[PDB]
Every structure is written in structure tokens, then in C-alpha cells.
């Protein structure tokens, strides 16, 4: 029936997707073998969204792993749950991307693209009716960013009536991994703003700071960040995975949370981030969760939302509490913190509570909103791109690949238009 086809790209995307699959398998009672070991009630009816019905009740994942380096499939297969996926979906090339977007899109994006299109089609027609496609990737390299944009564009051209939601990773000048990362980001943002419904912003430095200052972890690693993002996406999709009283969906959120198609970025976040020693001493209530979803300390941005005005807010809850407390909380927040959200648009907070609690934890609530804080990221990205493009350093590689330089010019022109739009809508005056 209503199923979601999941897509993979980039080694970081691959590992976060594997972590998400492991998390949902553990939550919904799935052994690493492939059978079912759950004991719940709602874990059988709507289980078919991410799985497929097969003989012996052995459910199979629905995810296509796209990569150029064979070293990723061996890594992800050796894990405790790497033997449960479909090896056919592991379409890998022979040459590496070399953190090049133009080369990866041009060279490794012509002969290998056909196979993944074939498999994603066969998956789409294997089902009756679908809603959208989820692709988790990163802009740090040529694997996720090089082909994610192309595949999203292709699936949009084929099936315009589908959900283009993604969780790409935004760069950070403080914590960098690629020398030419700003070039890749500039190339990627054009396609994300031209041929993408919605996109969420993901940073690793902010998650590192969050864990260091609140979780108090000895040796935080990428596994912790993968666990956090997996929990985030699980909270995102439980509106459809586990129906409750006030159920929502992805397209409703996309329509209600996006005032203009050019601005489809969001700000994800999860509320209960406490240390190990603090798990036995905590008060589970509404105002605490409200403060944790409203303060900028718990958010996973490397910026400050207080620099701008709140545009759209959605508070998705997952538990059995009430409805009155949420509305009174948002009411008093809008009353007191009047200088933080657009005055022209009242009631920018949406209500959403999932009656089905998650496994392992009794209280959970994620924060999805679009606040005025990405402007600084966009402006600094534009500035660094201009600085790099002034004298044309690290350009001969892209030039020798074949593509010209006017693409950079039009991309930066679009970037300037976007920042001008963002800044002139930040000060949304009521009238003259």
C-alpha cells in the first residue's frame, strides 16, 4: 500500500542509513537473521512501508545503495546487520570520485546511472502506489553530492508527484574535510533549490558540541552522530510509521512549512539530550520539553536562530500526554517571545502528538522548524566561494574534466539572489 522507497548515496550517507536501518529493526522487533522477533501490535500492520512481504515472513529492506568506491559495501556488509539487505542494490563503480563533483557527475555518472535507474524503477513498479523517495547523503565528497542531485532530478522528471525529502550535510569552515568543499556546496545548492522539494540541514560540529556539553561522552565518534540522526529521522517518520490521534505526513509538513519553494530548508532537532548520570534524575513533563525544543542550546545548528525571526514551527510529539499543555505553551511563548517570530503571521507552531511511544524510551519529541539562522551559513559560503573564484585556484581539474566556468558564475548569481531574498524577507515589516 503506502510505502516509501529509501535511497542511499555517499559513504557518510551509507553509514547513517545503515545505522537508521539497524535502529528501526531493533525498535520494531527484527532479528539480524531476517525473521520477526517483535512483541508489539502496531509493528505488523504498517510494517510494510519500509519492508516487502516475502515468504516465511522474512521482511527485506527497501533501500538502494549508490556509491563509486567498492570499499563501502564491504564495510557496511561486515556489520551485524549487513547480511540482511539486498546485494543487488549495491551498485558500485571501479574508480573513485576523488571528492570531485564535476568529474563524478560526468564520468562516473553516465555508464553507472542506468543500473540504479533500472533498480529504482523495478522497486517503484513492484508496489502499487508510492508517496515519495528518501535520500540521505552528504555534500562532503563526490559520491553523495555528485549523484544525489542527478538521481533526484531524474526521479522528479519521471514521477513529478513524489516527495523529494533529503538530509544532506552542510559544511562548516571550522570543521572541514575537503579543500574544494565550497565548490561542491555551491554546485549542490543550485540543484537543491531548483529540483528538490525539501531539504534538512545537518552539521557534525554542532552535534559534537551538543554531545560534549550535554551528553558528556568519553570518546564521542561518528557512531554517536549516526545514532542521533537515526533517532531524528525515526521521530520524523513516526507520524506515518506509528499512527496515533493526530497523525501527519511528509507532504502535509512540506506544504504547511514551506512559504516559498526557493526556501525549503529546515532545522531538525530532538528534545531529550541528557547525560548518562542524569537519566535517573529527570522530571518528565511538558514545559521542560518545550524549553529544550525552544532553546538554541539543544538545537543541532552551528549558528544562532535568535539572529532572525521564526518563520514556521512544527512540534512533533511521540507519547501519551495531552493536547492542552502544548497549545498553552506555544501561546505563552508567542506572547512573551514576540520579537523572535514573524508578527505578520500568527500561530506559526503546528501541533503533532504520536500516541505510540518509541521503543526503549517513554518520552520523546522532535523539533522541526524553519528559523532565520541559515543566512549566516549562506553568506559565509558565498564569501568563501567568491574568494576562491577570484583568482581561480583548484579550477584546472574541473576545467580539464570538460565543463566550463560559467556554471560557477550562474551558481554564485543564484546564491546572491537567494541571500538577498532571505535578508529582505527576514525583516518582514507589516506595512510601510
Amino acid at each position: 500500500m503506502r510505502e516509501i522507497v529509501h535511497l542511499q548515496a555517499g559513504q557518510c550517507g551509507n553509514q547513517i542509513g545503515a545505522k537508521f536501518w539497524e535502529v528501526i529493526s531493533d525498535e520494531h522487533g527484527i532479528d539480524p537473521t531476517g525473521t520477526y522477533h517483535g512483541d508489539s501490535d502496531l509493528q505488523l500492520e504498517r510494517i510494510n512501508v519500509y519492508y516487502n512481504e516475502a515468504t516465511g515472513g522474512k521482511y527485506v529492506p527497501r533501500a538502494v545503495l549508490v556509491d563509486l568506491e567498492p570499499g563501502t559495501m564491504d564495510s557496511v556488509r561486515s556489520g551485524p546487520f549487513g547480511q540482511i539487505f539486498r546485494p543487488d542494490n549495491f551498485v558500485f563503480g571501479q574508480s573513485g570520485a576523488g571528492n570531485n563533483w564535476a568529474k563524478g557527475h560526468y564520468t562516473e555518472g553516465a555508464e553507472l546511472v542506468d543500473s540504479v535507474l533500472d533498480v529504482v524503477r523495478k522497486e517503484a513498479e513492484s508496489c502499487d502506489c508510492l508517496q515519495g523517495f528518501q535520500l540521505t547523503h552528504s555534500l562532503g565528497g563526490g559520491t553523495g553530492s555528485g549523484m544525489g542531485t542527478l538521481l533526484i532530478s531524474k526521479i522528479r522528471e519521471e514521477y513529478p508527484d513524489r516527495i523529494m525529502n533529503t538530509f544532506s550535510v552542510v559544511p562548516s569552515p571550522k570543521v572541514s574535510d575537503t579543500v574544494v568543499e565550497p565548490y561542491n556546496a555551491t554546485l549542490s545548492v543550485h540543484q537543491l533549490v531548483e529540483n528538490t522539494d525539501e531539504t534538512y540541514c545537518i552539521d557534525n560540529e554542532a552535534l559534537y558540541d551538543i554531545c560534549f556539553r550535554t551528553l558528556k561522552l568519553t570518546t564521542p565518534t561518528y557512531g554517536d552522530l549516526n545514532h542521533l540522526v537515526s533517532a531524528t529521522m525515526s521521530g520524523v517518520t513516526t507520524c506515518l510509521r506509528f499512527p496515533g490521534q493526530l497523525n501527519a505526513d511528509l507532504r502535509k509538513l512540506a506544504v504547511n512549512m514551506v512559504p516559498f519553494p526557493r526556501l525549503h530548508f529546515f532545522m531538525p532537532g530532538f528534545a531529550p539530550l541528557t547525560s548518562r548520570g542524569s537519566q535517573q534524575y529527570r522530571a518528565l513533563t511538558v514545559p521542560e520539553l518545550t524549553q529544550q525544543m525552544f532553546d538554541a542550546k539543544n538545537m543541532m545548528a552551528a549558528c544562532d536562530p535568535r539572529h532572525g525571526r521564526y518563520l514556521t514551527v512544527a512540534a512533533v510529539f511521540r507519547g501519551r500526554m495531552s493536547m492542552k499543555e502544548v497549545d498553552e505553551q506555544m501561546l505563552n511563548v508567542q506572547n512573551k517571545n514576540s520579537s523572535y517570530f514573524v508578527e505578520w503571521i500568527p500561530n506559526n507552531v503546528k501541533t503533532a502528538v504520536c500516541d505510540i511511544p518509541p521503543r526503549g524510551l517513554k518520552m520523546s519529541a522532535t523539533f522541526i522548524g524553519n528559523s532565520t539562522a541559515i543566512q549566516e551559513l549562506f553568506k559565509r559560503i558565498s564569501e568563501q566561494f567568491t574568494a576562491m573564484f577570484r583568482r581561480k585556484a583548484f579550477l584546472h581539474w574541473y576545467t580539464g574534466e570538460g565543463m566550463d566556468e560559467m556554471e560557477f558564475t550562474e551558481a554564485e548569481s543564484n546564491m546572491n539572489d537567494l541571500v538577498s531574498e532571505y535578508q529582505q524577507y527576514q525583516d518582514a515589516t507589516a506595512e510601510e
Partner: protein, 49 residues
């Protein structure tokens, strides 16, 4: 006498400054409305495309 002359100059200097502040602010709100029209108009054309 120098002091009185220079104060008599300063008063009108500041008066002209304030009048020009008024003129500049009026022009800037005119710019604001014209720019709002810029924005929804160019949205219309990108939607048309």
C-alpha cells in the same frame, strides 16, 4: 562674536541635517515598496517559467 556666529551656523546646519534625514527616510520607504513589487513580480515570472 566668533562664538555667536558659529552657533548661529550650527543651528541651521543641524536643521538641514534633520530635513535631509526626513527626505532620505521617505525615499527609502519608496524603495521598500518598489522592492516588494520586484520580489512578487519576479516570483510570478519564475513560476511562469
Amino acid at each position: 562674536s566668533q562664538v555667536m556666529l558659529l552657533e548661529t551656523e550650527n543651528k541651521n546646519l543641524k536643521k538641514e541635517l534633520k530635513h535631509f534625514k526626513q527626505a532620505a527616510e521617505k525615499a527609502k520607504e519608496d524603495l521598500l515598496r518598489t522592492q516588494k513589487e520586484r520580489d512578487f513580480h519576479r516570483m510570478h515570472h519564475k513560476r511562469i517559467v
